[PDB]
mmCIF file with all atom_site columns, all heavy atoms in Angstrom:
data_model
loop_
_atom_site.group_PDB
_atom_site.id
_atom_site.type_symbol
_atom_site.label_atom_id
_atom_site.label_alt_id
_atom_site.label_comp_id
_atom_site.label_asym_id
_atom_site.label_entity_id
_atom_site.label_seq_id
_atom_site.pdbx_PDB_ins_code
_atom_site.Cartn_x
_atom_site.Cartn_y
_atom_site.Cartn_z
_atom_site.occupancy
_atom_site.B_iso_or_equiv
_atom_site.pdbx_formal_charge
_atom_site.auth_seq_id
_atom_site.auth_comp_id
_atom_site.auth_asym_id
_atom_site.auth_atom_id
_atom_site.pdbx_PDB_model_num
ATOM 1   N N   . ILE C 1 1  ? 3.196   -12.712 -17.020 1.00 0.00 ? 1  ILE C N   1
ATOM 2   C CA  . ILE C 1 1  ? 2.620   -13.841 -17.775 1.00 0.00 ? 1  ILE C CA  1
ATOM 3   C C   . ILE C 1 1  ? 2.289   -13.481 -19.228 1.00 0.00 ? 1  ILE C C   1
ATOM 4   O O   . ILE C 1 1  ? 2.716   -14.179 -20.150 1.00 0.00 ? 1  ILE C O   1
ATOM 5   C CB  . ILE C 1 1  ? 1.381   -14.473 -17.073 1.00 0.00 ? 1  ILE C CB  1
ATOM 6   C CG1 . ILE C 1 1  ? 1.699   -14.833 -15.616 1.00 0.00 ? 1  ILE C CG1 1
ATOM 7   C CG2 . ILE C 1 1  ? 0.929   -15.723 -17.813 1.00 0.00 ? 1  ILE C CG2 1
ATOM 8   C CD1 . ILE C 1 1  ? 2.843   -15.817 -15.453 1.00 0.00 ? 1  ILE C CD1 1
ATOM 9   N N   . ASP C 1 2  ? 1.531   -12.405 -19.431 1.00 0.00 ? 2  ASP C N   1
ATOM 10  C CA  . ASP C 1 2  ? 1.266   -11.897 -20.775 1.00 0.00 ? 2  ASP C CA  1
ATOM 11  C C   . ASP C 1 2  ? 2.498   -11.145 -21.269 1.00 0.00 ? 2  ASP C C   1
ATOM 12  O O   . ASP C 1 2  ? 2.907   -10.159 -20.653 1.00 0.00 ? 2  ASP C O   1
ATOM 13  C CB  . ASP C 1 2  ? 0.049   -10.966 -20.777 1.00 0.00 ? 2  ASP C CB  1
ATOM 14  C CG  . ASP C 1 2  ? -1.225  -11.657 -20.313 1.00 0.00 ? 2  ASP C CG  1
ATOM 15  O OD1 . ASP C 1 2  ? -1.168  -12.852 -19.948 1.00 0.00 ? 2  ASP C OD1 1
ATOM 16  O OD2 . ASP C 1 2  ? -2.289  -11.000 -20.311 1.00 0.00 ? 2  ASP C OD2 1
ATOM 17  N N   . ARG C 1 3  ? 3.092   -11.616 -22.366 1.00 0.00 ? 3  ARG C N   1
ATOM 18  C CA  . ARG C 1 3  ? 4.282   -10.973 -22.932 1.00 0.00 ? 3  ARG C CA  1
ATOM 19  C C   . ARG C 1 3  ? 3.938   -9.531  -23.310 1.00 0.00 ? 3  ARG C C   1
ATOM 20  O O   . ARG C 1 3  ? 3.239   -9.284  -24.294 1.00 0.00 ? 3  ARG C O   1
ATOM 21  C CB  . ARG C 1 3  ? 4.809   -11.748 -24.147 1.00 0.00 ? 3  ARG C CB  1
ATOM 22  C CG  . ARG C 1 3  ? 5.291   -13.174 -23.843 1.00 0.00 ? 3  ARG C CG  1
ATOM 23  C CD  . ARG C 1 3  ? 6.454   -13.202 -22.852 1.00 0.00 ? 3  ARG C CD  1
ATOM 24  N NE  . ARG C 1 3  ? 6.992   -14.550 -22.666 1.00 0.00 ? 3  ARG C NE  1
ATOM 25  C CZ  . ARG C 1 3  ? 7.967   -14.867 -21.813 1.00 0.00 ? 3  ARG C CZ  1
ATOM 26  N NH1 . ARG C 1 3  ? 8.533   -13.939 -21.047 1.00 0.00 ? 3  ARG C NH1 1
ATOM 27  N NH2 . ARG C 1 3  ? 8.380   -16.129 -21.723 1.00 0.00 ? 3  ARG C NH2 1
ATOM 28  N N   . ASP C 1 4  ? 4.439   -8.592  -22.511 1.00 0.00 ? 4  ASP C N   1
ATOM 29  C CA  . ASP C 1 4  ? 3.948   -7.212  -22.513 1.00 0.00 ? 4  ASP C CA  1
ATOM 30  C C   . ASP C 1 4  ? 4.327   -6.418  -23.763 1.00 0.00 ? 4  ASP C C   1
ATOM 31  O O   . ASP C 1 4  ? 5.408   -6.616  -24.322 1.00 0.00 ? 4  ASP C O   1
ATOM 32  C CB  . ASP C 1 4  ? 4.460   -6.467  -21.273 1.00 0.00 ? 4  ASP C CB  1
ATOM 33  C CG  . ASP C 1 4  ? 3.916   -7.041  -19.976 1.00 0.00 ? 4  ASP C CG  1
ATOM 34  O OD1 . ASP C 1 4  ? 2.687   -7.243  -19.877 1.00 0.00 ? 4  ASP C OD1 1
ATOM 35  O OD2 . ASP C 1 4  ? 4.720   -7.281  -19.050 1.00 0.00 ? 4  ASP C OD2 1
ATOM 36  N N   . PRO C 1 5  ? 3.431   -5.511  -24.204 1.00 0.00 ? 5  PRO C N   1
ATOM 37  C CA  . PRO C 1 5  ? 3.730   -4.546  -25.255 1.00 0.00 ? 5  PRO C CA  1
ATOM 38  C C   . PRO C 1 5  ? 4.302   -3.253  -24.678 1.00 0.00 ? 5  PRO C C   1
ATOM 39  O O   . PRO C 1 5  ? 4.442   -3.127  -23.458 1.00 0.00 ? 5  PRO C O   1
ATOM 40  C CB  . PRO C 1 5  ? 2.357   -4.290  -25.875 1.00 0.00 ? 5  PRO C CB  1
ATOM 41  C CG  . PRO C 1 5  ? 1.418   -4.411  -24.730 1.00 0.00 ? 5  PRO C CG  1
ATOM 42  C CD  . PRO C 1 5  ? 2.021   -5.417  -23.775 1.00 0.00 ? 5  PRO C CD  1
ATOM 43  N N   . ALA C 1 6  ? 4.621   -2.302  -25.553 1.00 0.00 ? 6  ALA C N   1
ATOM 44  C CA  . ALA C 1 6  ? 5.170   -1.013  -25.137 1.00 0.00 ? 6  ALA C CA  1
ATOM 45  C C   . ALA C 1 6  ? 4.059   0.014   -24.909 1.00 0.00 ? 6  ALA C C   1
ATOM 46  O O   . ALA C 1 6  ? 3.826   0.887   -25.749 1.00 0.00 ? 6  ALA C O   1
ATOM 47  C CB  . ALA C 1 6  ? 6.164   -0.504  -26.175 1.00 0.00 ? 6  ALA C CB  1
ATOM 48  N N   . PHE C 1 7  ? 3.380   -0.099  -23.770 1.00 0.00 ? 7  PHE C N   1
ATOM 49  C CA  . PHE C 1 7  ? 2.392   0.901   -23.345 1.00 0.00 ? 7  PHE C CA  1
ATOM 50  C C   . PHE C 1 7  ? 3.059   2.140   -22.745 1.00 0.00 ? 7  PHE C C   1
ATOM 51  O O   . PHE C 1 7  ? 2.419   3.183   -22.601 1.00 0.00 ? 7  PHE C O   1
ATOM 52  C CB  . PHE C 1 7  ? 1.411   0.309   -22.319 1.00 0.00 ? 7  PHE C CB  1
ATOM 53  C CG  . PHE C 1 7  ? 0.001   0.177   -22.826 1.00 0.00 ? 7  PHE C CG  1
ATOM 54  C CD1 . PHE C 1 7  ? -0.510  -1.061  -23.198 1.00 0.00 ? 7  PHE C CD1 1
ATOM 55  C CD2 . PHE C 1 7  ? -0.820  1.293   -22.920 1.00 0.00 ? 7  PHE C CD2 1
ATOM 56  C CE1 . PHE C 1 7  ? -1.815  -1.181  -23.662 1.00 0.00 ? 7  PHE C CE1 1
ATOM 57  C CE2 . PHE C 1 7  ? -2.125  1.183   -23.383 1.00 0.00 ? 7  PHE C CE2 1
ATOM 58  C CZ  . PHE C 1 7  ? -2.623  -0.057  -23.755 1.00 0.00 ? 7  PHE C CZ  1
ATOM 59  N N   . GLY C 1 8  ? 4.340   2.019   -22.398 1.00 0.00 ? 8  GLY C N   1
ATOM 60  C CA  . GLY C 1 8  ? 5.041   3.045   -21.637 1.00 0.00 ? 8  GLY C CA  1
ATOM 61  C C   . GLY C 1 8  ? 4.840   2.850   -20.145 1.00 0.00 ? 8  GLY C C   1
ATOM 62  O O   . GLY C 1 8  ? 5.166   3.734   -19.353 1.00 0.00 ? 8  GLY C O   1
ATOM 63  N N   . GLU C 1 9  ? 4.308   1.687   -19.765 1.00 0.00 ? 9  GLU C N   1
ATOM 64  C CA  . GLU C 1 9  ? 4.027   1.359   -18.368 1.00 0.00 ? 9  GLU C CA  1
ATOM 65  C C   . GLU C 1 9  ? 3.811   -0.146  -18.181 1.00 0.00 ? 9  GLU C C   1
ATOM 66  O O   . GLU C 1 9  ? 2.732   -0.667  -18.475 1.00 0.00 ? 9  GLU C O   1
ATOM 67  C CB  . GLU C 1 9  ? 2.789   2.119   -17.866 1.00 0.00 ? 9  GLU C CB  1
ATOM 68  C CG  . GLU C 1 9  ? 3.091   3.399   -17.092 1.00 0.00 ? 9  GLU C CG  1
ATOM 69  C CD  . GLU C 1 9  ? 1.868   3.964   -16.389 1.00 0.00 ? 9  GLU C CD  1
ATOM 70  O OE1 . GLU C 1 9  ? 0.732   3.678   -16.825 1.00 0.00 ? 9  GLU C OE1 1
ATOM 71  O OE2 . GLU C 1 9  ? 2.046   4.698   -15.392 1.00 0.00 ? 9  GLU C OE2 1
ATOM 72  N N   . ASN C 1 10 ? 4.849   -0.835  -17.712 1.00 0.00 ? 10 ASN C N   1
ATOM 73  C CA  . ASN C 1 10 ? 4.719   -2.211  -17.239 1.00 0.00 ? 10 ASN C CA  1
ATOM 74  C C   . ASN C 1 10 ? 4.496   -2.201  -15.731 1.00 0.00 ? 10 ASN C C   1
ATOM 75  O O   . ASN C 1 10 ? 3.594   -2.871  -15.224 1.00 0.00 ? 10 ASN C O   1
ATOM 76  C CB  . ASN C 1 10 ? 5.972   -3.026  -17.578 1.00 0.00 ? 10 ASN C CB  1
ATOM 77  C CG  . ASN C 1 10 ? 5.887   -4.469  -17.094 1.00 0.00 ? 10 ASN C CG  1
ATOM 78  O OD1 . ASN C 1 10 ? 4.806   -5.057  -17.031 1.00 0.00 ? 10 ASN C OD1 1
ATOM 79  N ND2 . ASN C 1 10 ? 7.036   -5.045  -16.755 1.00 0.00 ? 10 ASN C ND2 1
ATOM 80  N N   . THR C 1 11 ? 5.326   -1.430  -15.029 1.00 0.00 ? 11 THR C N   1
ATOM 81  C CA  . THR C 1 11 ? 5.242   -1.307  -13.577 1.00 0.00 ? 11 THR C CA  1
ATOM 82  C C   . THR C 1 11 ? 4.492   -0.043  -13.162 1.00 0.00 ? 11 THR C C   1
ATOM 83  O O   . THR C 1 11 ? 4.480   0.950   -13.893 1.00 0.00 ? 11 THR C O   1
ATOM 84  C CB  . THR C 1 11 ? 6.650   -1.294  -12.927 1.00 0.00 ? 11 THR C CB  1
ATOM 85  O OG1 . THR C 1 11 ? 6.525   -1.287  -11.499 1.00 0.00 ? 11 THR C OG1 1
ATOM 86  C CG2 . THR C 1 11 ? 7.450   -0.072  -13.370 1.00 0.00 ? 11 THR C CG2 1
ATOM 87  N N   . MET C 1 12 ? 3.870   -0.095  -11.985 1.00 0.00 ? 12 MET C N   1
ATOM 88  C CA  . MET C 1 12 ? 3.191   1.063   -11.407 1.00 0.00 ? 12 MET C CA  1
ATOM 89  C C   . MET C 1 12 ? 3.964   1.547   -10.181 1.00 0.00 ? 12 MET C C   1
ATOM 90  O O   . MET C 1 12 ? 5.003   0.982   -9.837  1.00 0.00 ? 12 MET C O   1
ATOM 91  C CB  . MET C 1 12 ? 1.757   0.701   -11.009 1.00 0.00 ? 12 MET C CB  1
ATOM 92  C CG  . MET C 1 12 ? 0.748   1.803   -11.299 1.00 0.00 ? 12 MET C CG  1
ATOM 93  S SD  . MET C 1 12 ? -0.256  2.272   -9.880  1.00 0.00 ? 12 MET C SD  1
ATOM 94  C CE  . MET C 1 12 ? -0.791  3.899   -10.408 1.00 0.00 ? 12 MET C CE  1
ATOM 95  N N   . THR C 1 13 ? 3.460   2.597   -9.537  1.00 0.00 ? 13 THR C N   1
ATOM 96  C CA  . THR C 1 13 ? 4.055   3.122   -8.306  1.00 0.00 ? 13 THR C CA  1
ATOM 97  C C   . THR C 1 13 ? 2.966   3.586   -7.339  1.00 0.00 ? 13 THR C C   1
ATOM 98  O O   . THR C 1 13 ? 2.119   4.405   -7.701  1.00 0.00 ? 13 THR C O   1
ATOM 99  C CB  . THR C 1 13 ? 5.000   4.309   -8.595  1.00 0.00 ? 13 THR C CB  1
ATOM 100 O OG1 . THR C 1 13 ? 4.308   5.304   -9.359  1.00 0.00 ? 13 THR C OG1 1
ATOM 101 C CG2 . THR C 1 13 ? 6.230   3.846   -9.363  1.00 0.00 ? 13 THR C CG2 1
ATOM 102 N N   . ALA C 1 14 ? 2.995   3.057   -6.116  1.00 0.00 ? 14 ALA C N   1
ATOM 103 C CA  . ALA C 1 14 ? 2.013   3.402   -5.086  1.00 0.00 ? 14 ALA C CA  1
ATOM 104 C C   . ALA C 1 14 ? 2.713   3.785   -3.783  1.00 0.00 ? 14 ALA C C   1
ATOM 105 O O   . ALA C 1 14 ? 3.495   3.002   -3.240  1.00 0.00 ? 14 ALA C O   1
ATOM 106 C CB  . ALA C 1 14 ? 1.070   2.234   -4.852  1.00 0.00 ? 14 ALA C CB  1
ATOM 107 N N   . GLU C 1 15 ? 2.426   4.990   -3.292  1.00 0.00 ? 15 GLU C N   1
ATOM 108 C CA  . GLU C 1 15 ? 3.019   5.501   -2.056  1.00 0.00 ? 15 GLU C CA  1
ATOM 109 C C   . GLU C 1 15 ? 1.955   5.637   -0.969  1.00 0.00 ? 15 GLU C C   1
ATOM 110 O O   . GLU C 1 15 ? 1.069   6.485   -1.068  1.00 0.00 ? 15 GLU C O   1
ATOM 111 C CB  . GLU C 1 15 ? 3.679   6.858   -2.306  1.00 0.00 ? 15 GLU C CB  1
ATOM 112 C CG  . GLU C 1 15 ? 4.816   6.808   -3.316  1.00 0.00 ? 15 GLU C CG  1
ATOM 113 C CD  . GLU C 1 15 ? 5.546   8.134   -3.466  1.00 0.00 ? 15 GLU C CD  1
ATOM 114 O OE1 . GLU C 1 15 ? 5.609   8.906   -2.485  1.00 0.00 ? 15 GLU C OE1 1
ATOM 115 O OE2 . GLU C 1 15 ? 6.065   8.402   -4.570  1.00 0.00 ? 15 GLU C OE2 1
ATOM 116 N N   . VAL C 1 16 ? 2.054   4.802   0.064   1.00 0.00 ? 16 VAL C N   1
ATOM 117 C CA  . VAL C 1 16 ? 1.069   4.766   1.147   1.00 0.00 ? 16 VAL C CA  1
ATOM 118 C C   . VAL C 1 16 ? 1.552   5.563   2.366   1.00 0.00 ? 16 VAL C C   1
ATOM 119 O O   . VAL C 1 16 ? 2.546   5.189   2.989   1.00 0.00 ? 16 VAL C O   1
ATOM 120 C CB  . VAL C 1 16 ? 0.787   3.313   1.587   1.00 0.00 ? 16 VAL C CB  1
ATOM 121 C CG1 . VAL C 1 16 ? -0.234  3.282   2.714   1.00 0.00 ? 16 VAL C CG1 1
ATOM 122 C CG2 . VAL C 1 16 ? 0.307   2.483   0.405   1.00 0.00 ? 16 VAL C CG2 1
ATOM 123 N N   . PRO C 1 17 ? 0.850   6.663   2.710   1.00 0.00 ? 17 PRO C N   1
ATOM 124 C CA  . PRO C 1 17 ? 1.167   7.414   3.924   1.00 0.00 ? 17 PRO C CA  1
ATOM 125 C C   . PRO C 1 17 ? 0.420   6.861   5.138   1.00 0.00 ? 17 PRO C C   1
ATOM 126 O O   . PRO C 1 17 ? -0.798  6.675   5.076   1.00 0.00 ? 17 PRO C O   1
ATOM 127 C CB  . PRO C 1 17 ? 0.681   8.826   3.594   1.00 0.00 ? 17 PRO C CB  1
ATOM 128 C CG  . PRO C 1 17 ? -0.439  8.631   2.628   1.00 0.00 ? 17 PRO C CG  1
ATOM 129 C CD  . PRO C 1 17 ? -0.264  7.284   1.967   1.00 0.00 ? 17 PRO C CD  1
ATOM 130 N N   . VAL C 1 18 ? 1.145   6.605   6.225   1.00 0.00 ? 18 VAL C N   1
ATOM 131 C CA  . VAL C 1 18 ? 0.557   6.048   7.445   1.00 0.00 ? 18 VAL C CA  1
ATOM 132 C C   . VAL C 1 18 ? 0.993   6.841   8.679   1.00 0.00 ? 18 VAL C C   1
ATOM 133 O O   . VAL C 1 18 ? 2.174   6.859   9.027   1.00 0.00 ? 18 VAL C O   1
ATOM 134 C CB  . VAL C 1 18 ? 0.955   4.567   7.637   1.00 0.00 ? 18 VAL C CB  1
ATOM 135 C CG1 . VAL C 1 18 ? 0.308   3.997   8.893   1.00 0.00 ? 18 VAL C CG1 1
ATOM 136 C CG2 . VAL C 1 18 ? 0.564   3.746   6.416   1.00 0.00 ? 18 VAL C CG2 1
ATOM 137 N N   . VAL C 1 19 ? 0.028   7.493   9.328   1.00 0.00 ? 19 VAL C N   1
ATOM 138 C CA  . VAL C 1 19 ? 0.265   8.220   10.576  1.00 0.00 ? 19 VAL C CA  1
ATOM 139 C C   . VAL C 1 19 ? -0.314  7.421   11.742  1.00 0.00 ? 19 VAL C C   1
ATOM 140 O O   . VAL C 1 19 ? -1.364  6.791   11.603  1.00 0.00 ? 19 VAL C O   1
ATOM 141 C CB  . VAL C 1 19 ? -0.382  9.620   10.544  1.00 0.00 ? 19 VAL C CB  1
ATOM 142 C CG1 . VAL C 1 19 ? -0.016  10.410  11.794  1.00 0.00 ? 19 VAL C CG1 1
ATOM 143 C CG2 . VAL C 1 19 ? 0.042   10.376  9.292   1.00 0.00 ? 19 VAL C CG2 1
ATOM 144 N N   . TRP C 1 20 ? 0.368   7.450   12.887  1.00 0.00 ? 20 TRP C N   1
ATOM 145 C CA  . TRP C 1 20 ? -0.063  6.684   14.061  1.00 0.00 ? 20 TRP C CA  1
ATOM 146 C C   . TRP C 1 20 ? -1.259  7.327   14.761  1.00 0.00 ? 20 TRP C C   1
ATOM 147 O O   . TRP C 1 20 ? -1.332  8.551   14.889  1.00 0.00 ? 20 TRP C O   1
ATOM 148 C CB  . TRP C 1 20 ? 1.092   6.506   15.054  1.00 0.00 ? 20 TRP C CB  1
ATOM 149 C CG  . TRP C 1 20 ? 2.080   5.475   14.617  1.00 0.00 ? 20 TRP C CG  1
ATOM 150 C CD1 . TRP C 1 20 ? 3.340   5.694   14.142  1.00 0.00 ? 20 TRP C CD1 1
ATOM 151 C CD2 . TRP C 1 20 ? 1.887   4.055   14.600  1.00 0.00 ? 20 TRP C CD2 1
ATOM 152 N NE1 . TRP C 1 20 ? 3.946   4.501   13.835  1.00 0.00 ? 20 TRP C NE1 1
ATOM 153 C CE2 . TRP C 1 20 ? 3.076   3.478   14.108  1.00 0.00 ? 20 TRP C CE2 1
ATOM 154 C CE3 . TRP C 1 20 ? 0.824   3.215   14.956  1.00 0.00 ? 20 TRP C CE3 1
ATOM 155 C CZ2 . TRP C 1 20 ? 3.233   2.098   13.958  1.00 0.00 ? 20 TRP C CZ2 1
ATOM 156 C CZ3 . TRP C 1 20 ? 0.983   1.841   14.810  1.00 0.00 ? 20 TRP C CZ3 1
ATOM 157 C CH2 . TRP C 1 20 ? 2.179   1.299   14.317  1.00 0.00 ? 20 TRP C CH2 1
ATOM 158 N N   . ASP C 1 21 ? -2.188  6.483   15.209  1.00 0.00 ? 21 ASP C N   1
ATOM 159 C CA  . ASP C 1 21 ? -3.386  6.925   15.923  1.00 0.00 ? 21 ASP C CA  1
ATOM 160 C C   . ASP C 1 21 ? -3.388  6.324   17.328  1.00 0.00 ? 21 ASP C C   1
ATOM 161 O O   . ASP C 1 21 ? -2.787  5.271   17.558  1.00 0.00 ? 21 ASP C O   1
ATOM 162 C CB  . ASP C 1 21 ? -4.654  6.493   15.177  1.00 0.00 ? 21 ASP C CB  1
ATOM 163 C CG  . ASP C 1 21 ? -4.513  6.601   13.667  1.00 0.00 ? 21 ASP C CG  1
ATOM 164 O OD1 . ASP C 1 21 ? -3.698  5.851   13.090  1.00 0.00 ? 21 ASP C OD1 1
ATOM 165 O OD2 . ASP C 1 21 ? -5.230  7.424   13.057  1.00 0.00 ? 21 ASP C OD2 1
ATOM 166 N N   . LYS C 1 22 ? -4.064  6.996   18.258  1.00 0.00 ? 22 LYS C N   1
ATOM 167 C CA  . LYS C 1 22 ? -4.115  6.557   19.653  1.00 0.00 ? 22 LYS C CA  1
ATOM 168 C C   . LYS C 1 22 ? -5.546  6.456   20.180  1.00 0.00 ? 22 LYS C C   1
ATOM 169 O O   . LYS C 1 22 ? -6.259  7.457   20.267  1.00 0.00 ? 22 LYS C O   1
ATOM 170 C CB  . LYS C 1 22 ? -3.307  7.506   20.546  1.00 0.00 ? 22 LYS C CB  1
ATOM 171 C CG  . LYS C 1 22 ? -1.824  7.158   20.658  1.00 0.00 ? 22 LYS C CG  1
ATOM 172 C CD  . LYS C 1 22 ? -0.987  7.748   19.525  1.00 0.00 ? 22 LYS C CD  1
ATOM 173 C CE  . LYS C 1 22 ? -0.390  9.099   19.900  1.00 0.00 ? 22 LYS C CE  1
ATOM 174 N NZ  . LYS C 1 22 ? -1.426  10.136  20.159  1.00 0.00 ? 22 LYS C NZ  1
ATOM 175 N N   . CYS C 1 23 ? -5.951  5.234   20.521  1.00 0.00 ? 23 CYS C N   1
ATOM 176 C CA  . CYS C 1 23 ? -7.195  4.980   21.245  1.00 0.00 ? 23 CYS C CA  1
ATOM 177 C C   . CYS C 1 23 ? -6.863  4.201   22.519  1.00 0.00 ? 23 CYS C C   1
ATOM 178 O O   . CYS C 1 23 ? -5.849  3.499   22.577  1.00 0.00 ? 23 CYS C O   1
ATOM 179 C CB  . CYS C 1 23 ? -8.178  4.197   20.375  1.00 0.00 ? 23 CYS C CB  1
ATOM 180 S SG  . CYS C 1 23 ? -8.615  5.022   18.825  1.00 0.00 ? 23 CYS C SG  1
ATOM 181 N N   . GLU C 1 24 ? -7.718  4.330   23.531  1.00 0.00 ? 24 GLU C N   1
ATOM 182 C CA  . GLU C 1 24 ? -7.452  3.762   24.858  1.00 0.00 ? 24 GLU C CA  1
ATOM 183 C C   . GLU C 1 24 ? -7.253  2.246   24.837  1.00 0.00 ? 24 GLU C C   1
ATOM 184 O O   . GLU C 1 24 ? -7.932  1.530   24.099  1.00 0.00 ? 24 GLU C O   1
ATOM 185 C CB  . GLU C 1 24 ? -8.589  4.107   25.826  1.00 0.00 ? 24 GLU C CB  1
ATOM 186 C CG  . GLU C 1 24 ? -8.646  5.576   26.220  1.00 0.00 ? 24 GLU C CG  1
ATOM 187 C CD  . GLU C 1 24 ? -9.889  5.927   27.023  1.00 0.00 ? 24 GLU C CD  1
ATOM 188 O OE1 . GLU C 1 24 ? -10.532 5.009   27.577  1.00 0.00 ? 24 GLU C OE1 1
ATOM 189 O OE2 . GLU C 1 24 ? -10.221 7.129   27.104  1.00 0.00 ? 24 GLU C OE2 1
ATOM 190 N N   . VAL C 1 25 ? -6.313  1.774   25.656  1.00 0.00 ? 25 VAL C N   1
ATOM 191 C CA  . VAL C 1 25 ? -6.055  0.345   25.825  1.00 0.00 ? 25 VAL C CA  1
ATOM 192 C C   . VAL C 1 25 ? -6.854  -0.176  27.014  1.00 0.00 ? 25 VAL C C   1
ATOM 193 O O   . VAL C 1 25 ? -7.073  0.548   27.987  1.00 0.00 ? 25 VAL C O   1
ATOM 194 C CB  . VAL C 1 25 ? -4.562  0.072   26.093  1.00 0.00 ? 25 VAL C CB  1
ATOM 195 C CG1 . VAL C 1 25 ? -4.295  -1.424  26.212  1.00 0.00 ? 25 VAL C CG1 1
ATOM 196 C CG2 . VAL C 1 25 ? -3.696  0.698   25.005  1.00 0.00 ? 25 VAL C CG2 1
ATOM 197 N N   . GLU C 1 26 ? -7.286  -1.433  26.931  1.00 0.00 ? 26 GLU C N   1
ATOM 198 C CA  . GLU C 1 26 ? -8.002  -2.086  28.026  1.00 0.00 ? 26 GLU C CA  1
ATOM 199 C C   . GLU C 1 26 ? -7.564  -3.546  28.155  1.00 0.00 ? 26 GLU C C   1
ATOM 200 O O   . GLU C 1 26 ? -8.070  -4.421  27.450  1.00 0.00 ? 26 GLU C O   1
ATOM 201 C CB  . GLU C 1 26 ? -9.518  -1.999  27.803  1.00 0.00 ? 26 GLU C CB  1
ATOM 202 C CG  . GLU C 1 26 ? -10.126 -0.617  28.047  1.00 0.00 ? 26 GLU C CG  1
ATOM 203 C CD  . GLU C 1 26 ? -10.077 -0.181  29.505  1.00 0.00 ? 26 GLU C CD  1
ATOM 204 O OE1 . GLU C 1 26 ? -9.903  -1.043  30.394  1.00 0.00 ? 26 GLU C OE1 1
ATOM 205 O OE2 . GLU C 1 26 ? -10.220 1.033   29.763  1.00 0.00 ? 26 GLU C OE2 1
ATOM 206 N N   . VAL C 1 27 ? -6.620  -3.798  29.059  1.00 0.00 ? 27 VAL C N   1
ATOM 207 C CA  . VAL C 1 27 ? -6.080  -5.141  29.271  1.00 0.00 ? 27 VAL C CA  1
ATOM 208 C C   . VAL C 1 27 ? -6.915  -5.898  30.307  1.00 0.00 ? 27 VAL C C   1
ATOM 209 O O   . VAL C 1 27 ? -7.420  -5.302  31.261  1.00 0.00 ? 27 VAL C O   1
ATOM 210 C CB  . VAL C 1 27 ? -4.605  -5.086  29.733  1.00 0.00 ? 27 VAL C CB  1
ATOM 211 C CG1 . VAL C 1 27 ? -4.034  -6.491  29.890  1.00 0.00 ? 27 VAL C CG1 1
ATOM 212 C CG2 . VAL C 1 27 ? -3.769  -4.279  28.750  1.00 0.00 ? 27 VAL C CG2 1
ATOM 213 N N   . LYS C 1 28 ? -7.062  -7.206  30.103  1.00 0.00 ? 28 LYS C N   1
ATOM 214 C CA  . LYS C 1 28 ? -7.809  -8.071  31.019  1.00 0.00 ? 28 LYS C CA  1
ATOM 215 C C   . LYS C 1 28 ? -6.964  -9.273  31.432  1.00 0.00 ? 28 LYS C C   1
ATOM 216 O O   . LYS C 1 28 ? -6.114  -9.736  30.668  1.00 0.00 ? 28 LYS C O   1
ATOM 217 C CB  . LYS C 1 28 ? -9.107  -8.549  30.362  1.00 0.00 ? 28 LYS C CB  1
ATOM 218 C CG  . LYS C 1 28 ? -10.079 -7.428  30.016  1.00 0.00 ? 28 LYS C CG  1
ATOM 219 C CD  . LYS C 1 28 ? -11.300 -7.944  29.263  1.00 0.00 ? 28 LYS C CD  1
ATOM 220 C CE  . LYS C 1 28 ? -12.235 -8.737  30.165  1.00 0.00 ? 28 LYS C CE  1
ATOM 221 N NZ  . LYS C 1 28 ? -13.484 -9.138  29.458  1.00 0.00 ? 28 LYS C NZ  1
#
C-alpha cells in the first residue's frame, strides 16, 4: 500500500520449526 523506499528490505523471512509432541488420548 505505501509505495516503498529502498531500505534494502521490503520482504522478510521467517522459518518456523515444529516438532511433534505426544500426550495421552481420551475418547468418549
